Amino acid sequence: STGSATTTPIDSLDDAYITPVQIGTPAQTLNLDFDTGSSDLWVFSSETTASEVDGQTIYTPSKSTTAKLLSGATWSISYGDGSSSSGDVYTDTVSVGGLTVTGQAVESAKKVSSSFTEDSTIDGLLGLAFSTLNTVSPTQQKTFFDNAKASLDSPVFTADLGYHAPGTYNFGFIDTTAYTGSITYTAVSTKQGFWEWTSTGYAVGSGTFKSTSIDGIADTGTTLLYLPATVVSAYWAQVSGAKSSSSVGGYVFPCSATLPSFTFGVGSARIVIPGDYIDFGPISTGSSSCFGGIQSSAGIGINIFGDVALKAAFVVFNGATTPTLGFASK
């Protein structure tokens, strides 16, 4: 089997992407944030504290003939940005782009943090990291991908995120029309439960490539590119007037600037992030100070190849017995 679904930016800055997901019978379609950096499929629901729901579409398990309470199971998750959610668990039928999993754990939120409430466009998350990170207790549950894997034509999914435009998540096949040149594959460590890999270096603009190992995660659920302070300083030093602002919470730059590209290495290959992808616009409405899309990972504890980086590539998440990651230009 295969599936193919379009993923759409939630706003004009590509802050996140939503993908329609069918849950239950008859289908209830929710728009979920596909997140390769976590492993829980959770939704706003009929059980979510009413004051914490503000415009989201909810899953109502009592209206699904295939929903079953997973008795005694609870979940609770905290994300790198400080947001969180928790609740109980149902199993139900879940379909993405024509690919159907029966018996998928659908984690129903009783509580969500303010960041989730305030984002009316995201109805929940669909985790695509390794199932070892799943938070369901006392019986850990599998991701949608893990459940689908044996049925897939090939044990892969691909992320093809757009810049200010829709893109695609495919399951079970590699669309050879969706990228240019060849796909370069690189080793993954699953030791922390992430799609963790090592970039071979970087360049700023038309500058020379610096060969240096940068360990990080491919994370579709993170907006920006978080890299070591040395790398980030080297990038922003090429933008007149750019500076790190503790009050704003990272590097800012004059909105009048033209940003240089940023290149990262994948083995001997190179992925170029155009300068415009690194512009996240005014820090507040009407400001001439703009927020940068490359930020320091110092004090995160991990480097994160988030959407800023991933949307410059066609990315293969290869879930074979020995997982790997592939990147192509597009």
Short mmCIF file of all heavy atoms in Angstrom, two decimals, residues 145 149 155-156 195 318-324, unseen atoms left out:
data_model
loop_
_atom_site.label_atom_id
_atom_site.label_comp_id
_atom_site.label_asym_id
_atom_site.label_seq_id
_atom_site.Cartn_x
_atom_site.Cartn_y
_atom_site.Cartn_z
N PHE A 145 3.23 5.46 11.33
CA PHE A 145 4.20 4.88 10.40
C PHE A 145 4.60 3.47 10.83
O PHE A 145 4.66 2.56 10.01
CB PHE A 145 5.42 5.80 10.28
CG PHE A 145 6.50 5.29 9.37
CD1 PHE A 145 6.23 4.91 8.06
CD2 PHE A 145 7.80 5.21 9.82
CE1 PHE A 145 7.24 4.44 7.23
CE2 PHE A 145 8.80 4.77 9.01
CZ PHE A 145 8.53 4.38 7.72
N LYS A 149 3.91 0.18 8.47
CA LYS A 149 5.16 -0.18 7.79
C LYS A 149 5.12 -1.50 7.03
O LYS A 149 5.56 -1.58 5.87
CB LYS A 149 6.29 -0.20 8.82
CG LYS A 149 7.66 0.14 8.27
CD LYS A 149 8.59 0.57 9.40
N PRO A 155 9.32 0.50 3.14
CA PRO A 155 9.14 1.02 4.51
C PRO A 155 9.69 2.44 4.71
O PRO A 155 10.63 2.65 5.49
CB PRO A 155 9.89 0.00 5.35
CG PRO A 155 11.00 -0.43 4.46
CD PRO A 155 10.43 -0.46 3.07
N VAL A 156 9.09 3.39 4.01
CA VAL A 156 9.60 4.75 3.94
C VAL A 156 8.45 5.72 4.01
O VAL A 156 7.31 5.40 3.66
CB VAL A 156 10.39 4.98 2.65
CG1 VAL A 156 11.51 3.98 2.52
CG2 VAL A 156 9.48 4.93 1.44
N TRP A 195 15.14 10.96 14.38
CA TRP A 195 15.83 10.81 13.11
C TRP A 195 17.11 11.64 13.19
O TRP A 195 17.18 12.75 12.67
CB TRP A 195 14.92 11.25 11.98
CG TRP A 195 13.75 10.32 11.79
CD1 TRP A 195 12.51 10.46 12.33
CD2 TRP A 195 13.71 9.13 10.98
NE1 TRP A 195 11.70 9.42 11.91
CE2 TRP A 195 12.42 8.60 11.09
CE3 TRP A 195 14.65 8.47 10.18
CZ2 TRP A 195 12.03 7.43 10.42
CZ3 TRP A 195 14.26 7.32 9.51
CH2 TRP A 195 12.96 6.81 9.64
N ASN A 318 13.78 6.71 5.82
CA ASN A 318 13.83 5.30 5.50
C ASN A 318 13.78 4.46 6.77
O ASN A 318 14.74 4.45 7.54
CB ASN A 318 15.10 5.00 4.71
CG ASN A 318 15.32 3.52 4.53
OD1 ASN A 318 14.38 2.74 4.54
ND2 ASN A 318 16.57 3.12 4.40
N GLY A 319 12.65 3.80 6.98
CA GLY A 319 12.39 3.01 8.18
C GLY A 319 12.68 1.54 8.01
O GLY A 319 12.06 0.68 8.65
N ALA A 320 13.64 1.23 7.15
CA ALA A 320 14.15 -0.13 7.03
C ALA A 320 14.78 -0.57 8.35
O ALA A 320 14.95 0.22 9.28
CB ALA A 320 15.15 -0.20 5.89
N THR A 321 15.13 -1.85 8.44
CA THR A 321 15.66 -2.42 9.68
C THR A 321 16.79 -1.56 10.24
O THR A 321 16.85 -1.31 11.44
CB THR A 321 16.16 -3.86 9.46
OG1 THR A 321 15.09 -4.65 8.93
CG2 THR A 321 16.63 -4.48 10.76
N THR A 322 17.68 -1.11 9.35
CA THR A 322 18.66 -0.07 9.68
C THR A 322 18.16 1.23 9.06
O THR A 322 18.28 1.42 7.85
CB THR A 322 20.03 -0.40 9.11
OG1 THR A 322 20.50 -1.63 9.67
CG2 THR A 322 21.04 0.68 9.43
N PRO A 323 17.57 2.12 9.87
CA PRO A 323 17.05 3.35 9.27
C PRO A 323 18.13 4.27 8.71
O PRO A 323 19.25 4.32 9.22
CB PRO A 323 16.31 4.03 10.43
CG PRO A 323 15.94 2.93 11.34
CD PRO A 323 17.10 1.96 11.26
N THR A 324 17.76 5.02 7.67
CA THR A 324 18.62 6.05 7.13
C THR A 324 17.78 7.25 6.72
O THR A 324 16.55 7.17 6.70
CB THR A 324 19.41 5.57 5.90
OG1 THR A 324 18.50 5.28 4.83
CG2 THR A 324 20.26 4.34 6.25
#
